[PDB]
Design a protein around this nucleic acid. Structure first.
Lengths: 143, 64, 117, 17, 201
RNA sequence: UAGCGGCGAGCGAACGGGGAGCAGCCCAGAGCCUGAAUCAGUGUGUGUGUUAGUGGAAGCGUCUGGAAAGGCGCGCGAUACAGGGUGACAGCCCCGUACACAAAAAUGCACAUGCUGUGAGCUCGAUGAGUAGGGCGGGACACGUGGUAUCCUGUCUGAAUAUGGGGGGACCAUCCUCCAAGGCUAAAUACUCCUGACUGACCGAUAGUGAACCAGUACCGUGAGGGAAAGGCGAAAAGAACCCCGGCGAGGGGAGUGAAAAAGAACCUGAAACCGUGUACGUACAAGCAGUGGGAGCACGCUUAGGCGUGUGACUGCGUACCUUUUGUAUAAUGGGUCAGCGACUUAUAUUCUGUAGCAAGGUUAACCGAAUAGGGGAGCCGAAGGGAAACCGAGUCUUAACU
């Protein structure tokens, strides 16, 4: 039967071959037009070039700054809050569940819904609705 | 090799939820005494990148 | 996977040269010239497939005009009489009748004359 | 078959200016 | 589902998901193609115009000569040196997801059962390492091209089938889609069957 | 990514995590005890490997044929149908192959046992100065002197020494960590001039190394240097005794060899351009891209006795090559003497979109381990939450004292 397997229709396209006859369609420059910079081998303009006009990424002013504290913080969903370990959640033991990462040292709990098992969170922050969600489930908040 | 982001572009455009980009208006640096408060006030908030030049922005920062 | 194109190329050239058989000089011997000759013959054949229809139409009209005048009527008058008499014989049959059957043509011109008058 | 190792150097008889 | 025997007539219980699922044509073909590509080694290369032995001296001056401009004796449009896009040693192996590999294997096993190309029997062994004995054992079973899959690999069976081209001896762990498809008949021992579900899961 | 950058083009980390592999010591010094472990060099003995090798299974009869290994029929070996050769395609004709053995002599590796040389263990002390640092000028760290830490150095200076000193990115204080200015150290890592075996969706004589043929040769250059072309008789030379024409030629015709000599060494197959001989038809009063449409006659064959086919083609209507580049070319614009061969959108890694396949609020592993295209490995990446320059807030957020 090894000579009977076939792929699904539309899985293959056979690619485009340039400069192979007239009837093949894109022959005689293979769809890159007549003379010009773009028609040359290796030709073209780099990213952001506008033909000499000041590029958009140069006409506009740079703004803001990067905060290092943002790279060491993460957000915790309610859906994944209850599948860490039993019913206790803290800054530690989330890395064991692999939902924040080793380097993260700050975390927050946001309202993502689908929380049923009552859980206790220590050392984390529950914004506004996470507090309500767990309390209905039967959890508690303490710092 | 992996593509290199245009660092200059990354300092002027920030990506948003629906794939757009926000940038600071480009006429509020100096020579401000002769400008009306109305024009300066309207330039303060960030604005979205136009459609025509959106394609250019995508190429500049393919990762961000 | 190197591919040699000797066999395929020779087949294509033979096919063109076969179609160029009978041409004069390099047009039947040299492929570069034979290909141009074959292509031009293709254009002429397409064009003359349409000129043949009009060329024969002219020949039939000339034959009918000669036969009708020999009977004492112009071609334009003769055709008009047939249309008035509701005769659907086309030029090809009319020319054929004139060449072979003179009596049949004499009846036709007589019929055309009656319709006109 | 063999490239002529020597290429003669011509002259401009006709300035054509 | 239920797998019948032809010698002991003993019932066997096996999950229908791994032996009674539908046959995925597209999925199986991709795995088979991937397996063939992984068998390549791609040990080839040519020399570009930079790697061809020669010198960079211009064959002749740019102007004055009556013939075409030339830059080097190693240009690809020149005899004895060239190859515009020379090949390099490359790896043709392609990635196949674990689940996709398992799914194709499950699909293949189910269809072998459907086409009755898979025969389950009790322990299959040969008393002595003799190809003659193995040939006799397969002759009375009307089998000529068979893939013997056993839970435990024994040198006695391995040596007996070594000189038989049409016969292959394999372990459950070392099972590949191509072998199952290629071979006309597959014979699996009771032990060999059990390990399949455990690894397939 | 953070950063650096005429903040342009571009350059581009670290911390931390997962793997491969892991090994720690000595001097700046005295005493007690002194082969006390570990090392290097020379003898002996065991094992293994290299340098020669040995044995190595099993088929015959008919048909075609120059010759069978082929077809047909019936057998046997296989821990050996991996390969090569043999008059066409051999598991059973030969060399080999799996397998089991082999070393007088020389050798690398891992051990045990002797000799030589430095050398264990404990107490106390010591613990690297023109150095660290600084001024000036440069260089290296992703970091271009910038607010610029850290390292190196040409030049000029110059400490403390453990109650001391260095670092933690200007700098200061507090804390944490380490001890420079003396050295040694296999493993995982990089490459193949060379040797053996094995493999290839690598090439098959204009390809593949420049070189399949005594090629880096012939040849070119004063020289450094550059640098070709050229493979194929047949199974076996059985390579044509002898005769004849010819100049005791060349070349040829016979004869013979062979399955084949239009396989005769100028040798397998033997295409095209190009050059010839023969046959049919046309052509010496007719003007041009040489064809096309119509078309008489003639010469060959076919059934029927009329045409059908093949070749030629008087006469006649229409008709100024191809490519390229151009608003536009028969153009007197470019390119091509012709034939054959070669000759131009590829490859690697990333990113986006489309199709398709798997799984699905989940998806997927990389290196690596792995008797290994399996299975492990979830480090990590993408996605489910966004807003703000940021802190921060959060289905909201930012803006503002606050929003109709």
């Amino acid at each position: 039967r090894l000579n009977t397997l076939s792929p699904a229709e539309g899985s293959k396209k056979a690619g485009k071959r340039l400069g192979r006859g007239i009837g093949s369609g894109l022959g005689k420059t293979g769809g890159r037009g007549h003379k010009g910079q773009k028609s040359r081998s290796g030709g073209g303009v780099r990213r952001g070039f506008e033909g000499g006009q000041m590029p958009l990424y140069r006409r506009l002013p740079k703004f803001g700054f990067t905060s290092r504290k943002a790279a060491i913080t993460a957000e915790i969903r309610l859906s994944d809050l209850a599948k860490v370990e039993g019913g206790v959640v803290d800054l530690n033991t989330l890395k064991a569940a692999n939902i924040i990462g080793i380097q993260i040292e700050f975390a927050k709990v946001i309202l993502a819904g689908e929380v049923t098992t009552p859980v206790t969170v220590r050392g984390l922050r529950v914004t506004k609705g996470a507090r309500a969600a767990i309390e209905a489930a039967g959890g508690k908040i303490e710092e | 090799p992996k593509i290199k982001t245009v660092r200059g572009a990354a300092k002027r455009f920030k990506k948003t939820g629906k794939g757009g980009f926000k940038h600071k208006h480009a006429n509020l640096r100096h020579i401000l005494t002769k400008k009306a408060t109305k024009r300066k006030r309207h330039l303060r908030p960030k604005a979205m990148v136009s459609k025509g030049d959106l394609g250019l922005v995508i190429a500049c920062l393919p990762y961000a | 996977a190197r591919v040699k194109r000797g066999v395929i190329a020779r087949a294509r050239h033979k096919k063109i040269l076969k179609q160029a058989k009978g041409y004069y000089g390099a047009r039947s011997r040299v492929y570069r010239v034979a290909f141009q000759a074959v292509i031009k013959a293709g254009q002429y054949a397409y064009r003359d497939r349409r000129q043949r229809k009009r060329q024969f139409r002219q020949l039939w009209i000339a034959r009918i005009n000669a036969a009708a005048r020999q009977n004492g009527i112009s071609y334009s008058k003769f055709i008009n009489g047939l249309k008035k008499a509701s005769v659907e014989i086309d030029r090809k049959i009319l020319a054929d009748i004139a060449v072979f059957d003179k009596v049949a043509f004499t009846a036709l011109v007589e019929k055309a004359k009656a319709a006109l008058a | 078959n063999n490239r002529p190792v020597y290429i003669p150097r011509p002259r401009p008889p006709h300035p054509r200016l | 589902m239920e797998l019948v025997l032809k010698d002991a007539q003993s019932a066997l219980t096996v999950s229908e998901t791994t032996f009674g699922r539908d046959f995925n044509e597209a999925l199986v073909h991709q795995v088979v193609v991937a397996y063939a590509a992984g068998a390549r080694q791609g040990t080839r290369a040519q020399k570009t115009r930079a790697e061809v032995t020669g010198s960079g001296k211009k064959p002749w001056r740019q102007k004055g000569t009556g013939r075409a401009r030339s830059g080097s004796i190693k240009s690809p449009i020149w005899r004895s040196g060239g190859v515009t896009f020379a090949a390099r040693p490359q790896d043709h192996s392609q990635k196949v997801n674990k689940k996709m590999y398992r799914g194709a294997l499950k699909s293949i096993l189910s269809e072998l059962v459907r086409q009755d190309r898979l025969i389950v029997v009790e322990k299959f062994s040969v008393e002595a390492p003799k190809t003659k004995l193995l040939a006799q054992k397969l002759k009375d079973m009307a089998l000529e091209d068979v893939l013997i899959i056993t839970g435990e690999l024994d040198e006695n069976l391995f040596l007996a089938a070594r000189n038989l081209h049409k016969v292959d001896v394999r372990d459950a762990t070392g099972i590949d889609p191509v072998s199952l498809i290629a071979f006309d008949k597959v014979v699996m021992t009771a032990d060999a069957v059990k390990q399949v579900e455990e690894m397939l899961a």
